[PDB]
Design an enzyme around this catalytic site. Structure first.
Site, short mmCIF file in Angstrom:
data_model
loop_
_atom_site.label_atom_id
_atom_site.label_comp_id
_atom_site.label_asym_id
_atom_site.label_seq_id
_atom_site.Cartn_x
_atom_site.Cartn_y
_atom_site.Cartn_z
N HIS A 266 0.82 -1.22 0.00
CA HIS A 266 0.00 0.00 0.00
C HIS A 266 0.86 1.29 0.00
O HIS A 266 0.69 2.18 -0.82
CB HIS A 266 -0.92 -0.04 1.25
N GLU A 267 1.79 1.39 0.94
CA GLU A 267 2.62 2.58 1.04
C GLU A 267 3.58 2.70 -0.11
O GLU A 267 3.86 3.78 -0.55
CB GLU A 267 3.38 2.58 2.36
N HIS A 270 1.72 4.50 -2.86
CA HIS A 270 1.84 5.95 -2.61
C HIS A 270 3.24 6.47 -3.03
O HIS A 270 3.36 7.45 -3.78
CB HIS A 270 1.63 6.29 -1.12
N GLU A 297 -4.68 7.74 -3.03
CA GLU A 297 -5.17 6.47 -2.49
C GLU A 297 -5.55 5.53 -3.63
O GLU A 297 -5.53 4.32 -3.46
CB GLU A 297 -6.36 6.72 -1.52
CO LIG Z 1 -3.17 5.15 1.86
#
Ligand SMILES: [Co+2]
Ligand SMILES: [Co+2]
Lengths: 504, 501
Positions: A266-267, A270, A297
């Protein structure tokens, strides 16, 4: 003229440099800083925040922006977009009077300690006086940010995080979700209960050193540039610091590896946006920034949800789990898919699976909207939280405000109009992947994922999204990238195919 | 009234807040920052450095200091000291024209590049152009910093690092050192050679995780506050970041552990001063700073040399080596003392023993002074360096500039007048330890060191030095602490007891 525009550029480069310090200071406070350095660090961050505020709010900036805007057509295309983004950053700091600002700051710092304890004690009644004041502050905030536009206060607030998003469109998007998702959840549950598939839970310990090595391996699979970023440990995973030096964190428990693996993925999603943010040649300027929190996101969830939780990725993942932790029965691609795609409704938003999650977001949207509207008052939040929870997720919270309306920090910290961006992110992610699979081909994307060969996918993300930063409007960006404006039908088809049809 | 003074206090707090950010950025640069972050980090630090400069040198500040100073009698003792330290900080920034500062930053940033390669390639000729400019720059800087004082330009440079130090006092001190140090070294070498004592060098590998654990353990012995500081790894060991958050670094090699251990103990001696610097209540003010680089290095060398290289400390250390690394023949009290206290003149100042170290410092002092005074020019430094190394240390450097004059980074980094403070620190450490032994008792001190029970010693350093920061002049500070101004005879007797007797 160029003259005032270029003078603005110079001011914004100054601000970028000061922001570098703040971002480092914030990263370090969560990772490296020992406990007694805390007051010194907060005092230092405050003083620097002050200077940035005085710099962007000096009378001359407005005058500069106004001179530059009368001569707009004398600027290159990207400079014109940059001037738009400059006005936006200036309006965001300038539209709130300092009296309001200090008042908000005092209340949010107060509101925090009051929330934290009441939450821990299940005491909504002790929170309620604060909560009433927050809601009045937010309503007041909306009006200030609304300015002379005639925008709905909540729209003015959502705009902080999601530039150009209207309440009309937001209500259409969430009404669309509301029409199908509560019944989809129920259908998926009953299908899974009637099937009775065996699911072997991974058995720990999973040594934290081997977890870290596995995580870095996956950051390499996503082609994270480690000469321009870091992985470390914090209490809450986040992606921070600066675009030239992007620093993500995670947290490990020996008892399981999934949360932390998927968290890093997830990160990293980003991070890839931050490390590749254009437009090139505008690096210290506000046009070279992530377009919105929903677009951001959308990148994290493209990584995590569209790739990370897919059946194809399980085929790649399973043998890495054997290699890094040693073999056990749970570590097959079919079983890991069952673990990672498991659907189990619960009360806590941050623990929600891919399918239930939007229902938690939708319900926060509705309440936020309704409070801002006057339709409901702080008083009624628990009642309505419970109504929505039973209705959407089949679970009760009456009398359990701790795991009900008090569970999230957001309102304490003065974040209203933030929540909806999460589901907008999920929708962006689904829309982008639909396009990518259309362009590259279904079997090609699956082959990239199952072999951990993501470059063709990452290249499409870079072309479609990352290189543009804030040079285009969100509507323009998504249209150019995917053929249309944000459309929730892609998220619906993704969820149906994955959970209801078990298609990957 | 007290208005200008209290407004200056507000200004210096602002500057303190800014310096916090710069200090963090600088530490992180050397410990955590990935290599591609480097350009953005330098640009950020430079923008903040500029804002700090413009803040402190604004004409407003001058007007405030002048107004505060005309009612200096309406101020309490610590406020008057703080106002003195304020003027000092302002003069340090405000004296050079901005055109001068630009030229220096340019020249020095380039000089670091050419120095580094010339050093690796043993090429003084390549460096000589840059060095003639540096020397021209330093002479100009000295005159600027002297102003209408009538101070020698080199004195004005020494003053930056050692406030209140005069060249005349420096010449009295090094002249004293010259009266006993050469016969002492000579004597020690012939003593050592006649004895022919067996020394066993510790045999690795020493796992870097084990070294780190040992180093942290000795930080605990020095009662380093880990809620207010860190140990981390860097290419070059330092003590940095801020007083609420003291962050020291080390570097580790598997082949030996001594350098890193003693290095960490050294930096921890600096850290103790920063973690406990007073005066209390003046934390964001310039009165709450270390007094001088001499006094600072006094704290590091009290830790490292006065405690860390003593026989008593070896009694404590030897069993810890066995514990952390596993037993081996070298790990005895007697033998480790011989390893750590070994005397062997060499060319490289960083690598120099406790006896030889002041000789390296004295030659640089002499050479910096002659360059500034125009008694030699940059072309002559290799020859003069050789001559002084032959006379002081018995060693020829002719044709080996890599291990001769190009050895050190200081001049390319814009640091002239800095070297003397190393020996001043050694002297401060020895004088401090004399008083400590006299007050506590020799037996109590030895007992403390040999049991790793340093509380009573640290308490004395705190009382005598740390709690005062810059509230007192250096002469006042040393007089209150030790009964007298800096006296090199304590250093003499320290070296005589340890190495000759
Ligand atoms: Co996020
Ligand atoms: Co030192």
């Amino acid at each position: 003229s160029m003259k005032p525009y270029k003078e603005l550029e110079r001011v914004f480069t100054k601000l970028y440099r000061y922001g570098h310090m703040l971002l480092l200071a914030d990263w370090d406070s969560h990772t490296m800083m020992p406990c007694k350095g805390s007051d010194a660090r907060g005092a230092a961050m405050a003083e620097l925040q002050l200077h940035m505020h005085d710099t962007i709010t000096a009378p001359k900036i407005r005058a500069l922006i106004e001179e530059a805007e009368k001569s707009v057509g004398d600027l290159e295309k990207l400079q014109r977009a940059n001037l738009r983004e400059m006005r936006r950053a200036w309006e965001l700091e300038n539209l709130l009077p300092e009296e309001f600002v200090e008042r908000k700051t005092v209340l949010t710092t107060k509101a925090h300690q009051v929330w934290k304890t009441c939450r821990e004690k299940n005491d909504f009644a002790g929170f309620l006086p604060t909560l009433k004041e927050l809601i009045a502050l937010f309503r007041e905030e909306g009006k200030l940010r609304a300015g002379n536009s005639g925008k709905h206060p909540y729209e003015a607030l959502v705009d902080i995080y999601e530039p150009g998003m209207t309440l009309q469109r937001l209500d259409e998007i969430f009404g669309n979700v509301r029409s199908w998702l509560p019944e989809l959840l129920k259908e998926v549950q009953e299908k899974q209960k009637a099937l009775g598939e065996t699911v072997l839970e991974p058995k720990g310990p999973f040594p934290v050193s081997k977890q870290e090595a596995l995580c870095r391996f996956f950051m390499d699979v996503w082609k994270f540039d480690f000469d321009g970023g870091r992985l470390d440990v914090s209490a809450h995973p986040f992606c921070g610091n600066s675009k030239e030096d992007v620093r993500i964190t995670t947290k490990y428990t020996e008892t399981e590896f999934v949360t932390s693996l998927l968290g890093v993925i997830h990160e990293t999603g980003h991070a890839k946006y931050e490390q590749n943010c254009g437009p090139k040649g505008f690096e210290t300027q506000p046009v070279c920034m992530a377009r919105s929190l929903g677009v951001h996101e959308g990148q994290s969830l493209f990584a995590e949800m569209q790739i990370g939780r897919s059946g194809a990725f399980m085929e790649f993942l399973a043998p890495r789990l054997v290699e890094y932790f040693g073999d056990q029965p749970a570590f097959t691609s079919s079983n890991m898919k069952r673990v990672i795609q498991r659907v189990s409704p619960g009360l806590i938003r941050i623990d929600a699976d891919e399918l239930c999650y939007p229902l938690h977001v939708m319900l926060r949207y509705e309440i936020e909207r309704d409070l801002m509207d006057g339709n409901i008052e702080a008083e009624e939040v628990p009642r309505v939280w419970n109504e929505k929870m039973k209705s959407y997720l089949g679970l009760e919270t009456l009398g359990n405000d701790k795991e009900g309306c008090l569970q999230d920090v957001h309102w304490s910290g003065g974040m209203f109009g933030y929540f909806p961006t999460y589901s907008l992110g999920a929708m962006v992610a689904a829309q982008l992947m639909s396009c990518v699979r259309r362009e590259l081909g279904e079997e090609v994307v699956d082959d990239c994922i199952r072999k951990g060969d993501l470059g063709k996918i990452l290249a499409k993300q870079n072309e479609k999204i990352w290189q543009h930063g804030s040079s285009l409007t969100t509507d323009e960006l998504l249209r150019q990238a995917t053929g249309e404006t944000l459309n929730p039908e892609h998220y619906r088809r993704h969820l149906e195919r994955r959970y209801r049809d078990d298609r990957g």
